[PDB]
């Protein structure tokens, strides 16, 4: 949303209210613009979890946003970001999240819980074609069970930029099973 | 391993053995179907198609003779250039009776080996 800059001035820039952030795209880049105030708001929403874009000179109103960056620093306040769009029908490198609900199985009865080393899902469905919020939770939880890649259950866009059997999300003893 | 330490069979380094010095790499490349040798001499040297089974057709005298000549001649072709004492090049296999053959060539070829 907006964000400007692109000359050659990171220090002061990298200072005050404007944080660096390259204009990255397949084939071309352009001095860092943006701002340490927009990043906020938007970013605050769900960086590489949905997507939008800003109007700098109406130039090229496109999506793709961030494919890297960091609040690095100790303090925990980012500085020096990466920005890449995608006006193509190739959209792959697509990492969008996936949520459950709380389906009661090991929890609200077994107190047991479940780790989700997954959460996210870098895949590649129908380029410029993804539900900013995709949910899938067949339920199940408790004892020494576990679910991961393999099973899963992918809708429409048949990608999987990923593999089978691997960090899905299981149920462990928040105390004992 | 480094390219030449995971494959097998060659000895190229037993070529570099003579590399050090002594003269032309009177290297004799074989392929049954025929024999073909050059003359890799030190300094990004080169060669002078000194002897080949095709150069002058491939005849019909098999191994024996072939060599016997290919060499000789070869040796003939070169000593016209201005060489003299050239180092041998077992290129490959053991100075088999072929090999040995060609070999003769050089020797008889008057190109000292």
């Amino acid at each position: 949303m907006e964000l400007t800059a692109k000359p050659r001035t990171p220090k002061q820039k990298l200072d005050e209210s404007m944080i660096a952030a390259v204009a990255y795209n397949k084939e071309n880049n352009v001095s860092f613009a943006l701002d340490r105030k927009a990043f906020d708001r938007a970013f605050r929403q769900q960086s590489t979890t949905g997507l939008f874009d800003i109007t700098v000179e109406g130039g090229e109103t496109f999506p793709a946003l961030v494919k890297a960056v960091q609040m690095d620093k100790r303090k925990r306040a980012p500085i020096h970001v990466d920005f890449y769009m995608v006006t193509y029908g190739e959209p792959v490198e697509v990492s969008v999240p996936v949520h459950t609900t709380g389906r009661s199985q090991g929890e609200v009865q077994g107190g047991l819980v479940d780790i989700v080393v997954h959460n996210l899902q870098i895949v590649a469905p129908g380029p410029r074609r993804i539900p900013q919020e995709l949910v899938v939770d067949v339920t199940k939880m408790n004892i020494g069970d576990h679910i991961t890649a393999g099973d899963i259950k992918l809708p429409e866009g048949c990608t999987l930029a990923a593999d089978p059997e691997l960090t899905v999300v299981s149920v462990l003893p928040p105390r004992l099973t | 391993p480094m390219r030449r330490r995971r494959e097998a069979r060659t000895d190229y380094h037993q070529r570099l053995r003579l590399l050090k010095s002594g003269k032309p790499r009177l290297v004799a490349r074989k392929s049954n179907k025929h024999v073909r040798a050059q003359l890799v001499t030190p300094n990004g040297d080169d060669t002078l198609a000194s002897a080949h089974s095709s150069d002058l057709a491939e005849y019909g005298w098999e191994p024996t003779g072939s060599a016997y000549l290919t060499g000789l001649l070869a040796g003939l072709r070169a000593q016209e250039a201005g060489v003299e004492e050239a180092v041998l090049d077992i290129g490959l296999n053991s100075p088999t009776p072929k090999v040995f053959a060609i070999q003769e060539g050089a020797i008889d070829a008057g190109l000292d080996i």
Partner: protein, 138 residues
């Protein structure tokens, strides 16, 4: 930064003796956690402990995860007196590099675990930083 004699000649190859990592429960978004800023060969023991007392006060779901762990150690009085000092080991930990990802109180809506960790900081030693993660804490 004086450190030890080697990873297998003086004292290197242990379990360091402690109480493992993970606790609490999952959670996809909710980013609930703790880190620091202080530098200190984190007092093993003190360490191990601390964190633990953490579980002692909570119990289940709240990433009682914790990303620390000592692995080297000091030494002192053993032998003659003060001069040519040989070495007698004791007390390993790990450098808390001037702040960083401590342990995580990670989960949907379960501050009943935030306060916890909280109780977890209180403890500890080198001050500590009370914080949230990508998004905050819900």
């Amino acid at each position: 930064s004086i450190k030890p004699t080697r990873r297998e000649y003086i004292s290197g190859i242990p379990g360091k003796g402690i109480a493992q990592f993970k606790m609490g429960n999952n959670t996809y978004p909710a980013q609930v956690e703790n880190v620091v800023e202080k530098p200190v060969q984190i007092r093993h023991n003190a360490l191990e402990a601390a964190r633990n007392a953490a579980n002692r006060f909570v119990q289940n779901s709240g990433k009682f995860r914790i990303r620390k762990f000592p692995f080297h150690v000091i030494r002192e009085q053993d032998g003659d007196g003060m001069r040519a000092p040989f070495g007698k080991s004791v007390g390993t930990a790990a450098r808390s590099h001037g702040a960083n990802h401590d342990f995580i109180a990670w989960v949907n809506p379960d501050p009943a675990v935030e306060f916890a960790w909280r109780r977890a900081y209180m403890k500890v030693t080198p001050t500590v930083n009370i914080d949230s993660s990508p998004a905050g804490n819900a």
